[PDB]
Design a protein around this ligand. Structure first.
Ligand SMILES: [Ca+2]
Ligand code: NA
Length: 259
């Protein structure tokens, strides 16, 4: 059941990092789970620092919320920032100090594909408003895998491209009029890109939308609360139909409603 985003619920805290290494990070589930994982499997990456390689994996939700990881993967190359996603058995992440997206198959711990995002800024050229080298933000929605970025040709406006999940080729590209560094983060629901106005405010909003199906841009005023005042990661999971976010040590989730 697709539709336009009309409401975001209150953030629910599922886990809190215990060290500064997890001030920012990304946590995620696979909306297209594949053996040996399930819809309960959760991954967590604490992303502070310069040689981020540890990916914590939890087989079931209770372990993610209360226990130790069931497995730790050591990535073969350091990861950049908070934009990564898991999709159909692979972690898609950006190589540190690069515009390269890497497909890392989790079960086999194998790199299956790598792609430079053509023309994408990286390492602080088109971050979201908080910085954090957030130039490249992967996304999964009801239609599959996407990447959110910008380029010099787009003058820093958000660009989004649909990606082939097997080989990382770009399938189609859209250019918005939204300055990427003017918004706190972004995510895609049902082919519409949404942005969040602030990473600090308890009274932020989902403030812009761009519908890739119609080409129409809109302003919105949907309330969005940063409970802990520093949201470094905001993504959408189309299986759960929820937002997943990382806010100042806290892994949080928001319910949503679509028209
Ligand atoms: Ca995002
Ligand atoms: Na992302």
């Amino acid at each position: 059941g697709c539709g336009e985003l009309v409401w975001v619920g209150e953030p629910l805290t599922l886990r809190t990092a215990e060290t500064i290494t997890g001030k920012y990070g990304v946590w995620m589930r696979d909306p297209k789970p594949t053996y040996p994982y399930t819809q309960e499997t959760t991954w967590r990456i604490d992303t502070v620092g310069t040689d981020v390689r540890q990916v914590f994996e939890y087989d079931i939700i209770s372990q993610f919320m209360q226990g130790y990881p069931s497995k730790v993967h050591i990535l073969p190359r350091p990861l950049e920032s908070t934009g990564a996603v898991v999709y159909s058995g692979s972690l898609y992440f950006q190589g540190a100090e690069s515009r390269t997206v890497i497909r890392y198959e989790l079960n086999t711990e194998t790199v299956k594909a790598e792609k430079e995002i053509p023309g994408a800024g990286y390492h602080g050229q088109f971050p979201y408003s908080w910085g954090g080298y957030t130039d490249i933000d992967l996304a999964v929605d009801e239609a599959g895998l996407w990447v959110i970025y910008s380029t010099d040709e787009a003058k820093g406006a958000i660009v989004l491209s649909k990606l082939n999940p097997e080989n990382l080729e770009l399938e189609q590209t859209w250019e918005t009029n939204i300055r990427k560094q003017s918004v706190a983060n972004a995510f895609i629901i049902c082919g519409t890109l949404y942005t969040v106005s602030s990473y600090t405010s308890a009274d932020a909003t989902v403030n812009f939308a761009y519908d890739t199906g119609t080409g129409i841009s809109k302003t919105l005023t949907i309330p969005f609360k940063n409970r802990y005042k520093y949201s470094s990661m905001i993504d959408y999971n189309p299986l759960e139909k929820k937002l997943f976010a990382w806010d100042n040590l806290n892994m949080v989730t928001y319910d949503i409603k679509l028209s």
